[PDB]
Subunit: 413 residues, 3 copies
């Protein structure tokens, strides 16, 4: 074929009961620094855009060629001109060669790739704005190598960078080797990571940036992809168990955290399901929980659990009423790292959002949608003490109850 334009975009406004700014974000709680995302409904005031320009080509022999570039930007400003704070950057630029006539046996319908990209098989938990796994970087690999016609595999080499790319003394390359295997609804991903002499990176002064940072790592994922709502009702569901050690201890953005100690050990559980309660009510519950030890400091510990619940009630072919409920518990023990103070408590979010759209209201993924909303947030006051440049406890966002209102659009195509 030819050219294709795909993308994602969120844009909107959030204000408090006084008609002034406030804090918002899927990652605003103290637990968010370690990936403890909360519901995103009526809780994202940024204008984020991903523009995907493609050039596809199918040859007569069945062989396909595919080139794609992603140009992204995220702004918190509401103004029509944001040159001074622009974050516009090329996120991806890759080439895929699929269904080559020359590829036989287990490589029959396999697709080869090279360049900078997000792995094709990453998957997320939409309502919480968090990927379950996110393998991205620059490299090469092959998708869909079929063995015995019931076990497909992906093999790849992804490279990343730690530190300042400009400073040759504070810059290191991190390589990731991964095998991704699929057997029915079952998934098993195993990655090996290595960033040589990560521990010897010297900052601009001449001192070691870390010194106790890891140079290697291991990462694994065990996933269950069901075509039903946890096997007891119509719908879908995904449950994943993540584990990592050393550089692999940041279980979501594989190889994206250069500060991890050699003994960093993480376990994360991700799970969500989709199901219709009637021809008008749809429910999408979700859970994210993690336990991370000896992560950045010896003897530290980060533990948290999020529970998000998105509910949509159709009223028209175009009008719906969406509701969201977030609950999160955290017990954080940073051990001085980044001037963080040990904290524990819970966060609550209640959002009511009148929603307009044209597509299937029962489909949590039909996108052109415009929503109006109101949220209420509260949390254990102790949480304010985690950090001083935090959102929780900052000026005007320290009290018990916090109300917010706004409008926003979101789509993808």
């Amino acid at each position: 074929s030819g050219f294709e334009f795909h993308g994602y975009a969120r844009s909107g406004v959030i204000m408090n009961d006084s008609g002034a700014s406030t804090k918002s974000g899927a990652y605003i709680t103290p637990a968010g620094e370690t990936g403890g995302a909360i519901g995103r409904l009526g809780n994202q005031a940024d204008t984020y855009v991903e523009m995907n320009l493609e050039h596809k080509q199918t040859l007569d022999n069945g062989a396909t060629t595919r080139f794609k570039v992603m140009v992204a930007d995220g702004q918190t400003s509401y103004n029509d001109w944001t040159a001074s704070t622009s974050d516009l950057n090329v996120r991806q630029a890759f080439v895929e060669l699929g269904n080559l006539p020359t590829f036989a046996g287990p490589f029959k319908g396999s697709t080869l790739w090279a360049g900078k990209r997000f792995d094709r098989d990453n998957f997320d938990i939409h309502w919480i704005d968090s990927d379950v796994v996110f393998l991205a970087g620059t490299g090469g690999g092959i998708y869909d190598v079929k063995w015995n016609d019931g076990l497909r595999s992906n093999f790849s080499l992804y490279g990343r960078n730690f530190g300042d790319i400009d400073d040759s003394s504070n810059s290191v390359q991190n390589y990731i080797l991964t095998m991704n295997h699929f057997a029915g609804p079952l998934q098993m991903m195993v990655s090996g990571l290595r960033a040589k002499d990560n521990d010897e990176r010297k900052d601009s002064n001449g001192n070691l940036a870390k010194g106790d940072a890891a140079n290697t790592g291991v990462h694994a994922l065990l996933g269950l992809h069901n075509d039903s709502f946890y096997g007891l009702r119509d719908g879908s569901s995904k449950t994943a168990l993540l584990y990592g050690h050393g550089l692999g201890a940041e279980v979501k953005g594989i190889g994206s955290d250069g500060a991890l100690r050699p003994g960093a050990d993480t376990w994360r559980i991700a799970s969500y399901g989709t199901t219709p309660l009637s021809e008008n009510w749809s429910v999408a519950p979700a859970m994210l929980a993690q336990r991370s030890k000896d992560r950045y400091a010896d003897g530290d510990s980060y533990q948290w659990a999020t529970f998000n619940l998105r509910l949509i009630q159709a009223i028209n072919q175009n009008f719906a009423l969406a509701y969201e409920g977030s609950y999160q518990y955290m017990d954080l023990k940073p051990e001085g790292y980044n001037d963080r103070q040990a904290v524990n408590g819970s966060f609550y979010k209640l959002t009511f959002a009148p929603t307009f759209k044209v597509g299937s209201i029962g489909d949590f993924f039909s996108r052109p949608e415009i929503r109006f909303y109101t949220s209420w947030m509260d949390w254990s006051k102790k949480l304010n003490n985690y950090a001083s440049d935090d959102a929780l406890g900052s000026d005007g966002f320290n009290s018990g109850g916090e109300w917010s209102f706004g409008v926003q659009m979101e789509t993808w195509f």
Copy 2:
């Protein structure tokens, strides 16, 4: 349908009689700081670009879906690589849901929207590179709510920002509520603005950035959209009368000036018309005049009037001779604000521009056009004293007569 690519672009060169750089710009006179634009022909040496990527969709039931992103940049450099000074930024990102089957009564053919955008109904005076009204920002609203089938209305909430978005103590959100009514050729726009605690923004030091800055404002527009040249000849014309007080005292870029005093008061008149003088001559006169008091400083006063006159003489199906005449009078009394000195006097611009094009030469808006030109400018020497980092009076641009030459292209689609 699918994808659409629209945009605008101007690019060219301007040199003086010595083959060296000079000053140029629709806003180069002292009057330009408060919106006093002048002719743009042979007076724009920047390479400005707006790239609009869209994804439209029309459903079988008549309902439309529309997503658009604007990415813009403006460079004064002539070089082929401008990474170091790039201003590439996302100006807009919005979604429009039109002609929904669920919308009845006055909402029949109305279109809902949300995101960052320039309001659909803003209009400009092209030859002077100035909008008449420019409502933009992030928010939501509805277009074309028909009452009694002869009175349409637009209602919206647009949000903007004052100060440095990164500095929480020097950052404020400004909200705007507007109702835009149309009755035949008549238009009446009324907006109310509010940026809470604008007056309490402290700069990076700890001092108040302004202190006497306004926190609220009101803005109004009375417009006449004629389908004839001022009702006495074939063509078109528009005449608008603008008024604003407080934050609304910047009558063009609504809610874009956070330094306005509470008692800031402005009146502005905009008017232009288009008409063919024969099957070869077309004329487009234009006028912009403003009177602003207690704007930035107590007792200040800004008053200016611009008169632009664009004439085109067809010679071929592809060749034309364009002429532009600009006259501007100003009486500015800044009262020490920004080290500006009271000044008064006039500015003159005469431009001759051999133009090449393929479209209708009589249409002032048929765009693909390439022009060669020569301009002469002169002004009251007193004007040079308004500012010291100004264009008028700077090195090599202080004398009476100033000649310029160049080539440029301009289009939109």
Copy 3:
């Protein structure tokens, strides 16, 4: 017609035998600072992208209209998000009016243009990542003016900038007048350049940035474009002889070097050919050599010669084995300029690259291709002393033999 999307893109990874970063680039040898490029195969670890968005239009009378914007970026980082170091910028924005009914005689099928662009008639030596001639900037001109129906000419005015565009005292515009003539396989290009008071640019302090810099220049190109492999075998070839003086002494990027002395004198010879050795082997030899005197410092001298040899052996319809051999000799005498020390010696590069593609393997220009590789480099140890912030001799890249491995993709459409 309508919209068109074209572009170019390379993206890959290069690591040494320890799985860590190394130095790479077509211009990494000391000779590279003056244009001494070497083979690029398995020697480019950056993610460079050019995105060309166009809006074409053909009218019923045969007249065409064309608008193009180029947005480019280059990153050495492997990460998925590079906002902090993004180099995204508008490289071009121009308009072409072709085959106008009004244009008769020698201007019959000529095409008029204006804006910022890379000249249509520039050409390169792909395997070495170097243009032969590169005229770019902002201006206007006309292409294909036919005289006696066997002599076509291009005439144009391109403007560029020297110094910081923001600093009015350290900014100068350089203008270039050029006539490009074609008579069969023969080409003769002559350009005159001028940047008034380039020698009087004062840096931020108040001192002269150069003082002995040139204000004018002359450039000439003599080229032979053959439809055979140097007239003795099937294929193609191009041989060009470049000469420049003063500002014209940078013979590739015309008008791009503002530090050239008035007596700067350069001669460059560029030549390459393409030919199939059999139905499976293709060979592309190339040569670039230059002699530049009194360039930046009185009595300085830069002389180098690169010989590149690209060979491809088809094995399948999809698989090929590419080989590259680079040899370069240099004798550099900087005379204290930039703290460079006089150096002389040679550089060697051997690359083996298993390549996958769908297109014509024998065509060096069929692009969708993914390559895996291994390279070996070595050079005279003396070369390490040219500079201290150089690649040769830097930490971990000073020894004799240097091995590298990686994967990359490259395309254009």
